[PDB]
Design a protein around this motif. Structure first.
Motif, PDB file in Angstrom:
ATOM      1  N   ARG B   8       0.850  -1.183   0.000  1.00 53.64           N
ATOM      2  CA  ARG B   8       0.000   0.000   0.000  1.00 53.64           C
ATOM      3  C   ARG B   8       0.889   1.237   0.000  1.00 53.64           C
ATOM      4  NH1 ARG B   8      -5.072   0.066   0.688  1.00 53.64           N
ATOM      5  NH2 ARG B   8      -4.921  -2.006   1.646  1.00 53.64           N
ATOM      6  N   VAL B   9       0.586   2.179  -0.885  1.00 53.44           N
ATOM      7  CA  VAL B   9       1.448   3.332  -1.128  1.00 53.44           C
ATOM      8  C   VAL B   9       1.102   4.443  -0.147  1.00 53.44           C
ATOM      9  CG1 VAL B   9       1.941   5.179  -2.767  1.00 53.44           C
ATOM     10  CG2 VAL B   9       1.943   2.803  -3.517  1.00 53.44           C
ATOM     11  N   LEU B  10       2.124   4.965   0.534  1.00 55.90           N
ATOM     12  CA  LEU B  10       1.954   6.025   1.515  1.00 55.90           C
ATOM     13  C   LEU B  10       2.452   7.383   1.037  1.00 55.90           C
ATOM     14  CD1 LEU B  10       3.029   4.022   4.699  1.00 55.90           C
ATOM     15  CD2 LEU B  10       0.739   4.333   3.741  1.00 55.90           C
ATOM     16  N   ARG B  11       2.866   7.508  -0.218  1.00 55.93           N
ATOM     17  CA  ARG B  11       3.297   8.804  -0.736  1.00 55.93           C
ATOM     18  C   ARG B  11       2.075   9.679  -0.987  1.00 55.93           C
ATOM     19  NH1 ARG B  11       7.021   9.224  -6.133  1.00 55.93           N
ATOM     20  NH2 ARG B  11       8.558   8.273  -4.728  1.00 55.93           N
ATOM     21  N   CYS B  20      -3.461  -0.230  -3.397  1.00 54.70           N
ATOM     22  CA  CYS B  20      -2.691  -1.465  -3.398  1.00 54.70           C
ATOM     23  C   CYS B  20      -2.016  -1.683  -4.746  1.00 54.70           C
ATOM     24  CB  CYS B  20      -3.582  -2.662  -3.061  1.00 54.70           C
ATOM     25  SG  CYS B  20      -4.028  -2.781  -1.314  1.00 54.70           S
ATOM     26  N   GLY B  21      -0.749  -2.100  -4.697  1.00 58.00           N
ATOM     27  CA  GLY B  21       0.006  -2.417  -5.892  1.00 58.00           C
ATOM     28  C   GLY B  21       0.901  -3.609  -5.633  1.00 58.00           C
ATOM     29  N   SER B  22       1.536  -4.085  -6.699  1.00 58.00           N
ATOM     30  CA  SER B  22       2.390  -5.264  -6.645  1.00 58.00           C
ATOM     31  C   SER B  22       3.837  -4.870  -6.899  1.00 58.00           C
ATOM     32  CB  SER B  22       1.943  -6.311  -7.667  1.00 58.00           C
ATOM     33  OG  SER B  22       0.597  -6.696  -7.448  1.00 58.00           O
ATOM     34  N   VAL B  23       4.735  -5.328  -6.027  1.00 60.14           N
ATOM     35  CA  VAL B  23       6.159  -5.063  -6.197  1.00 60.14           C
ATOM     36  C   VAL B  23       6.689  -5.878  -7.367  1.00 60.14           C
ATOM     37  CG1 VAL B  23       8.419  -5.210  -5.108  1.00 60.14           C
ATOM     38  CG2 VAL B  23       6.438  -4.501  -3.774  1.00 60.14           C
ATOM     39  N   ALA B  24       7.375  -5.208  -8.290  1.00 60.77           N
ATOM     40  CA  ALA B  24       7.936  -5.855  -9.468  1.00 60.77           C
ATOM     41  C   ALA B  24       9.423  -6.151  -9.338  1.00 60.77           C
ATOM     42  CB  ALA B  24       7.698  -4.989 -10.709  1.00 60.77           C
ATOM     43  N   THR B  25      10.221  -5.177  -8.905  1.00 57.15           N
ATOM     44  CA  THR B  25      11.664  -5.345  -8.803  1.00 57.15           C
ATOM     45  C   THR B  25      12.190  -4.404  -7.729  1.00 57.15           C
ATOM     46  OG1 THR B  25      11.874  -5.965 -11.147  1.00 57.15           O
ATOM     47  CG2 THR B  25      13.871  -5.224 -10.030  1.00 57.15           C
ATOM     48  N   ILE B  26      13.034  -4.928  -6.844  1.00 54.92           N
ATOM     49  CA  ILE B  26      13.727  -4.126  -5.841  1.00 54.92           C
ATOM     50  C   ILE B  26      15.191  -4.073  -6.259  1.00 54.92           C
ATOM     51  CG2 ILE B  26      14.378  -3.871  -3.434  1.00 54.92           C
ATOM     52  CD1 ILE B  26      11.834  -5.488  -2.755  1.00 54.92           C
ATOM     53  N   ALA B  27      15.653  -2.893  -6.665  1.00 53.52           N
ATOM     54  CA  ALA B  27      17.040  -2.737  -7.077  1.00 53.52           C
ATOM     55  C   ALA B  27      17.947  -2.607  -5.862  1.00 53.52           C
ATOM     56  CB  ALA B  27      17.193  -1.516  -7.983  1.00 53.52           C
ATOM     57  N   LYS B  28      19.102  -3.262  -5.925  1.00 53.14           N
ATOM     58  CA  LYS B  28      20.080  -3.259  -4.840  1.00 53.14           C
ATOM     59  C   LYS B  28      21.244  -2.366  -5.263  1.00 53.14           C
ATOM     60  CE  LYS B  28      18.914  -7.820  -2.982  1.00 53.14           C
ATOM     61  NZ  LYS B  28      17.798  -8.114  -3.921  1.00 53.14           N
TER      62      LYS B  28
ATOM     63  N   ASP D  85      -9.141   4.205   5.111  1.00 54.08           N
ATOM     64  CA  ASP D  85      -7.708   4.335   4.895  1.00 54.08           C
ATOM     65  C   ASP D  85      -7.244   3.605   3.644  1.00 54.08           C
ATOM     66  OD1 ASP D  85      -7.389   5.880   7.201  1.00 54.08           O
ATOM     67  OD2 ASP D  85      -7.077   4.115   8.468  1.00 54.08           O
ATOM     68  N   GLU D  86      -8.165   2.972   2.913  1.00 54.43           N
ATOM     69  CA  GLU D  86      -7.841   2.223   1.710  1.00 54.43           C
ATOM     70  C   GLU D  86      -8.361   2.867   0.435  1.00 54.43           C
ATOM     71  OE1 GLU D  86      -9.718  -1.468   2.526  1.00 54.43           O
ATOM     72  OE2 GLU D  86      -8.480  -1.923   4.280  1.00 54.43           O
ATOM     73  N   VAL D  87      -9.153   3.927   0.538  1.00 54.53           N
ATOM     74  CA  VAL D  87      -9.607   4.681  -0.622  1.00 54.53           C
ATOM     75  C   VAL D  87      -8.652   5.844  -0.844  1.00 54.53           C
ATOM     76  CG1 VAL D  87     -12.018   3.999  -0.547  1.00 54.53           C
ATOM     77  CG2 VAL D  87     -11.235   5.856   0.907  1.00 54.53           C
ATOM     78  N   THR D  88      -8.362   6.140  -2.108  1.00 56.72           N
ATOM     79  CA  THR D  88      -7.414   7.201  -2.416  1.00 56.72           C
ATOM     80  C   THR D  88      -8.011   8.567  -2.095  1.00 56.72           C
ATOM     81  OG1 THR D  88      -6.050   8.183  -4.159  1.00 56.72           O
ATOM     82  CG2 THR D  88      -8.176   7.238  -4.818  1.00 56.72           C
ATOM     83  N   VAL D  89      -7.140   9.497  -1.705  1.00 56.99           N
ATOM     84  CA  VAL D  89      -7.566  10.804  -1.224  1.00 56.99           C
ATOM     85  C   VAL D  89      -6.562  11.854  -1.690  1.00 56.99           C
ATOM     86  CG1 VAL D  89      -6.398  10.803   1.042  1.00 56.99           C
ATOM     87  CG2 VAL D  89      -8.614  11.957   0.782  1.00 56.99           C
TER      88      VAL D  89
END
Ligand code: CLA
Ligand code: CLA
Ligand code: CLA
Ligand code: CLA
Ligand code: CLA
Ligand code: CLA
Ligand code: CLA
Ligand SMILES: CCCCCC(=O)OC\C(C=C=C1C(C)(C)C[C@H](OC(C)=O)C[C@@]1(C)O)=C/C=C/C(C)=C/C=C/C=C(C)/C=C/C=C(\C)C(=O)C[C@@]12O[C@]1(C)C[C@@H](O)CC2(C)C
Ligand SMILES: CC(=O)O[C@H]1CC(C)(C)C(=C=C/C(C)=C/C=C/C(C)=C/C=C/C=C(C)/C=C/C=C(\C)C(=O)C[C@@]23O[C@]2(C)C[C@@H](O)CC3(C)C)[C@](C)(O)C1
Ligand SMILES: CC1=C(C#C/C(C)=C/C=C/C(C)=C/C=C/C=C(C)/C=C/C=C(C)/C=C/[C@@]23O[C@]2(C)C[C@@H](O)CC3(C)C)C(C)(C)C[C@H](O)C1
Lengths: 155, 63, 50, 92, 188, 171
Positions: B8-11, B20-28, D85-89
């Motif tokens: 879940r994106v917190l930006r 919700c999204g899916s992680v594709a690649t984590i660069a090291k 908290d799961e819906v975009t805002v």
């Protein structure tokens, strides 16, 4: 307790309802009903005699004990007896209905409330006699209410 | 977090904030935003993925 | 139209009760035949056990 | 002149068509919501909305007749509403 | 929180069918078809089951008192009447109208004082935070009931049942004075 | 466990700190308000009723105040109240009782609940202070006479109004 009398039983118990509501409350209610009935039959026959309480007026007018509980209500005498019996019986309600269907009935499930003032005899014959006359006066007062609603006098 | 995780994106300025999204690649390496997250809903330009930092993802489901 | 409408109301109410309770959550196409033991038309009404 | 007061002797006015429309509108909304859930749970959600899965759509459409009960069951079960908290805002 | 299962108040006559029984309570969960006690899970605006129990206990107690007053005022048994005050209106729902302000204004005043001063912890309810209060536990008759568990629960279930019947009855005597016929055998 | 009711438990909070505690609380009324307020109310009521009994049985048998004049108060203590309300002397009595009640009652009830003194002292010992056994005996006698004269004044007034007082000082 009290069994039949000359045989030995739990009395006539065809319904067998002694295993439904506790025997202590059954015995207490039996004694209270009987003592109420004993005072009831004696008061009934004493009013039919013509004897009068110290409070005069309207007591010899509403004789035969059947207009007694229709005119003493509106005369206000009946309310005082109601409230006196109510206060003593609410003291009894505390001391009895505090314990039911549960916590112990260790007051002797009958007449254990006081009363050890004048005689102090405590005969077992007295207990057996008390319950026997209790139920005899239950039926006696039932008869005195029902037969005298159509007949009068001594019947 | 790992590749294939559900995050879940917190930006707050992202189009998929609290989404919700899916992680594709984590660069090291020295990348400031190494984690690649792909989403099922396109944004206004129509771009499905974005690069996110490790503290901007709250994680939902393990691979 | 000749008969009292309360008779129809009570009849429809009894049928509504019967078929609300005969399948407690098994309405709709996607929920009725979820159990692979409910064969179609078997509401369990076979008292005489034919 | 129609009396939209709510008096019982004027229930042939607004109130009874009000109940009828509320039932029908809830029917339409619940049918749309159920088909939306089904199309979300498939492999091509976009193609299921421009090209309707007609048998499944008719199934939800006819099964939305008990919408006030199904919606209440989903509300009690916690499936009707997203936590928030799961819906975009927007950032504010 | 207390999840409605340990709350006494389930009824045998809603498990009257073959299957389910007891002393007076239904075994598999108390009656709640609309799941109103589960409404606290979605939003905190909906009250907890503790607030609902306090509300129905208050409603039941006031309804027992009200239906007893209805049964007694409707035919005779009125308080003695003095100067500037007559308790003669035998018709219920109109008796406070024929009454001086020193009498109808005194019942409401003391009811309000007793309601406000026994309101300590009702808002610690609505959220399941019992600790104190314990639904209807005003103190009038605590330690008077039996000290075991089965007899106390039996006594509480008796209180809840009589109360519910009284509620339904006082609302049957009402809604019948309002519109003629909501109770076939009415007497009032 | 009680003494006045030796069949039904013993009332809570009636341990015996106050004098004359036989455990007579069948209604359990010692829980609505603190016991200091209840003891203060009992003592104040008893003192008022003892003074009331003395005043009633002295006025009724015949005695008049300095310059008490000749009105329907002088006829009997029955109409003395309605006489002195109209003459306004009851307003002066209410003023004096209100002043002493402000000072005494406000101080006495404010400080027991804070915690400071026995319930109902007033510190006007007037003599006997050193013999604490006589102090507790006098406390017991005071509360016993308090209850007795509360009953006595109730009986006096009810007897006199039940016959509208046909000039009977035995009544
Ligand atoms: C409960 C107490 C009480 C009450 C309500 C009354 C009320 C009354 N008495 Mg009475 N009386 C009492 C006790 C009481 N008495 C006692 C104990 C005695 C001694 C035997 C008397 C002796 C007495 C006589 C001889 C007469 C009355 C009269 C009257 C009437 C008019 C009084 C008047 O003008 O006062 C209002 C005027 C005042 C100046 C107020 C009095 C102020 C005093 C000092 C009391 C104030 C408080 C006091 C200090 C107590 C506080 C104690 C504290 C320190 C602990 C009235 C009905 C007279 C009457 O008309 O009857 C026919 C009358 O002739 N009384
Ligand atoms: C109404 C008051 C009353 C009550 C509470 C009791 C209660 C009791 N009796 Mg008792 N009894 C009564 C009246 C009563 N009796 C009368 C009037 C008689 C004379 C016939 C007897 C004669 C009797 C005997 C000979 C014995 C008992 C026994 C008992 C005990 C166990 C039996 C039982 O529970 O069934 C009684 C239950 C009821 C009375 C419930 C009421 C049922 C219906 C409503 C009454 C019938 C309606 C109509 C009058 C007919 C119990 C303490 C036995 C005992 O002591 O056991 C140790 C025993 O040996 N009783
Ligand atoms: C029937 C049961 C019963 C019994 C055995 C007693 C026995 C007793 N009571 Mg009692 N009492 C009773 C019922 C009873 N009471 C009831 C029903 C009331 C309320 C009206 C009272 C109110 C009462 C008071 C107020 C007092 C007693 C006291 C007493 C004790 C002294 C004897 C006396 O003066 O009697 C009194 C009997 C009736 C008033 C004695 C142990 C006295 C006490 O505790 O002394 C230490 C006392 O002060 N009793
Ligand atoms: C007449 C039949 C009768 C008999 C034999 C008894 C017998 C008894 N009663 Mg009893 N009682 C009766 C009628 C009777 N009662 C009635 C009608 C009432 C209601 C007022 C009571 C109320 C009562 C109480 C409240 C108490 C007793 C108690 C007792 C016991 C001891 C007291 C005693 O010796 O009483 C002798 C009684 C008589 C000689 C009857 C008098 C005859 C008149 C004057 C005619 C004893 C078992 C006490 C007890 O069991 O304590 C543990 C107790 O506390 N009884
Ligand atoms: C069945 C689908 C559906 C459902 C359940 C809802 C539900 C809602 N909409 Mg909505 N809406 C929809 C479709 C739907 N909408 C569509 C298709 C559009 C584009 C035209 C909109 C445009 C829209 C706006 C602009 C607003 C809402 C608002 C709202 C809310 C208040 C009710 C209202 O104003 O209704 C009014 C609904 C409309 C005006 C649109 C109805 C269009 C048709 C009739 C419904 C679609 C039926 C669908 C084709 C069935 C196919 C399924 C089948 C295959 C089984 C409510 C949550 C309001 C809101 O946010 O309030 C909080 C608001 O301001 N909606
Ligand atoms: C003031 C009303 C009131 C309230 C707050 C409650 C509250 C409660 N009851 Mg209860 N009950 C009531 C009245 C009430 N009751 C009456 C009158 C009856 C007799 C029919 C019952 C019979 C009953 C049983 C048999 C049981 C409960 C149970 C419960 C508990 C869980 C159920 C629940 O969440 O209900 C929440 C209730 C409300 C929020 C009341 C509001 C009602 C709706 C929302 C609005 C009004 C609609 C209604 C149909 C009004 C139309 C007219 C009406 C007078 C008929 C809860 C503490 C269960 C229990 O004991 O659990 C431990 C249980 O088994 N109740
Ligand atoms: C018959 C109906 C009935 C029953 C069975 C109960 C039962 C109970 N009430 Mg209750 N109550 C009732 C009616 C009833 N109440 C009414 C009408 C009111 C309004 C005045 C109240 C107000 C009330 C308060 C304010 C409190 C209780 C409490 C209690 C509990 C403690 C035991 C007690 O004091 O009651 C004993 C009851 C009986 C022996 C039956 C009553 C006997 C008859 C009907 C009297 C008739 C006069 C108990 C579960 C307390 C509680 O919940 O604490 C846990 C508490 O704080 N009740
Ligand atoms: C019960 C009240 C409600 C009912 C009213 C009532 O009763 O009627 C009134 C009535 C007459 C009447 C009526 C008519 C007018 C004729 C007609 C009416 O008809 C109508 C309605 O029109 C009916 C009726 C019956 O009303 C008769 C009533 C008589 C009544 C009520 C008599 C109470 C004495 C109390 C005493 C002696 C206490 C002493 C207590 C004492 C002495 C003590 O304090 C002792 C003490 O030890 C204690 C306890 C504790 C210790 O620490 C301290 C000490 C040691 C000091
Ligand atoms: C018409 C009708 O029906 O009603 C009638 C009824 C009735 C009863 C007949 C009537 C009356 C008469 C009434 C009401 C009379 C009321 C009289 C009243 C109440 C009179 C207060 C005096 C205050 C004094 C003496 C203060 C002394 C103060 C003194 C002595 C001090 O030393 C104060 C002190 O400060 C020093 C100086 C130094 C300080 O360090 C120490 C202290 C604090 C101790 C009326 C009016 O006619 C109405
Ligand atoms: C503390 C103090 C002091 C003080 C003091 C004081 C004021 C002490 C006072 C004590 C006082 C005044 C105690 C009264 C009791 C009254 C009783 C018992 C009434 C009984 C009445 C009874 C029992 C019955 C009455 C009847 O009416 C009934 C019931 C029916 C009628 O038919 C028959 C009669 C009429 C008979 C000092 C020392 C003076 C100065 C010091 O500085 C401070």
């Amino acid at each position: 307790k009290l069994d039949g009398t000359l045989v030995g039983d739990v009395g006539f118990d065809p319904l067998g309802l002694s295993n439904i509501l506790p025997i202590e409350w059954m015995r207490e209610a039996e004694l209270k009903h009987g003592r109420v009935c004993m005072l009831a039959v004696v008061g009934y026959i004493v009013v039919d005699k013509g004897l009068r309480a110290p409070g005069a007026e309207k007591l010899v007018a509403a004789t035969s004990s059947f207009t007694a509980h229709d005119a003493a209500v509106q005369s206000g005498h009946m309310w005082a007896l109601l409230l006196a019996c109510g206060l003593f019986e609410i003291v009894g309600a505390g001391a009895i209905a505090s314990t039911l269907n549960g916590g112990d009935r260790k007051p002797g499930e009958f007449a254990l409330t006081g009363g050890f003032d004048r005689d102090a005899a405590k005969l077992e014959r007295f207990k057996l006699a008390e319950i026997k006359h209790s139920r005899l006066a239950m039926m006696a007062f039932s008869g005195l209410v029902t037969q005298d609603a159509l007949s009068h006098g001594a019947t | 977090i790992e590749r294939g995780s559900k995050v879940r994106v917190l930006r707050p300025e992202s189009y998929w904030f609290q989404e919700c999204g899916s992680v594709a690649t984590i660069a090291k390496g020295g990348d400031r935003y190494p984690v690649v997250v792909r989403f099922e809903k396109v944004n206004y330009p129509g771009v499905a993925p974005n690069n996110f930092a490790l503290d901007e993802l709250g994680e939902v489901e393990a691979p | 139209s000749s008969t009292p409408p309360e008779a129809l109301a009570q009849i429809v109410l009894v049928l509504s009760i019967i078929e609300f309770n005969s399948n407690k959550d098994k309405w709709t196409m996607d929920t009725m035949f979820t159990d692979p033991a409910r064969e179609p038309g078997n509401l369990g009404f076979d008292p005489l056990k034919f | 002149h129609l009396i939209a007061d709510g008096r019982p002797d004027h229930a042939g006015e607004f109130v009874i068509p009000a109940f009828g429309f509320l039932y029908i509108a809830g029917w339409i909304g619940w049918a749309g919501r159920s088909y939306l859930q089904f199309s979300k749970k498939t492999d091509k959600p976009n193609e299921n909305e421009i090209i309707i899965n007609v048998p499944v759509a008719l199934g939800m459409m006819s099964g939305a007749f008990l919408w006030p009960l199904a919606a209440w069951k989903e509300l009690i079960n916690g499936q009707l509403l997203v936590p928030g908290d799961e819906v975009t805002v927007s950032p504010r | 929180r207390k999840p409605l299962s340990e709350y006494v108040g389930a009824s045998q006559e809603l498990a009257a069918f073959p299957g389910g029984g007891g002393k007076e309570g239904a075994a598999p969960v108390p009656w709640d078809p609309l799941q109103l006690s589960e409404l606290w899970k979605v939003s905190a605006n909906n009250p907890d089951v503790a607030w609902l129990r306090e509300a129905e206990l208050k409603h039941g107690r006031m309804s027992m008192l009200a239906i007893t007053g209805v049964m007694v005022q409707s035919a005779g048994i009125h308080l003695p009447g003095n100067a500037d005050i007559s308790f003669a209106n035998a018709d219920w729902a109109m008796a406070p109208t024929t009454l001086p302000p020193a009498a109808w204004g005194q019942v409401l005043f003391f009811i309000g004082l007793a309601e406000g001063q026994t309101s300590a912890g009702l808002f610690d309810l609505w959220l399941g935070n019992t600790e104190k209060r314990e639904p209807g536990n005003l103190g009038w008759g605590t330690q008077f009931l039996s000290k075991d568990k089965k007899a106390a629960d039996k006594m509480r279930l008796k209180e809840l049942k009589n109360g519910r019947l009284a509620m339904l009855a006082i609302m049957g005597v009402a809604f019948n004075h309002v519109i003629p016929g909501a109770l076939p055998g009415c007497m009032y």
